[PDB]
């Protein structure tokens, strides 16, 4: 593909899950501690439709990485795994689009 800066995490989050306080804290926390195993992760952006406020677009989340070096060694080990019962589709995302949440 092409390394940019931030990592992408798709096919591992549903709108029916990113609506609960328990499920949310569970994903953000876990995904964080995990992403911080291959390198350094600045932050994490995971939509949270307010009672269905951001549903039209919900389903894709990711984390803001520091370097593409660890971002590569990370996604290379996250691809093929399983968030729970579905193959996780990790990719690369541009820090710019991330900031604006343009979703890439």
């Amino acid at each position: 593909g092409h390394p940019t800066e931030v990592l992408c995490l798709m096919n591992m989050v549903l709108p029916e899950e990113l609506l609960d306080d328990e499920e949310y804290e569970e994903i953000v926390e876990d995904v964080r501690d995990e992403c911080s195993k291959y390198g350094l992760v600045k932050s994490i952006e995971i939509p949270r439709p307010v009672d269905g406020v951001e549903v039209p677009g919900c389903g894709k989340i990711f984390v803001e990485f520091t370097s593409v070096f660890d971002c590569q060694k990370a996604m290379q080990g996250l691809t093929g795994r399983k968030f729970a019962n579905r193959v996780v589709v990790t990719k690369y995302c541009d820090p710019d689009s991330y900031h604006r949440r343009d979703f890439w």
């Binding site: 926390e29 876990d30 795994r81 399983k82 193959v87």
Partner: peptide
């Protein structure tokens, strides 16, 4: 830091 070894979130089988 918790949530490190309890519930696998990257299985396959």
């Amino acid at each position: 830091p918790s949530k490190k070894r309890k519930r696998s979130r990257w299985n396959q089988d």
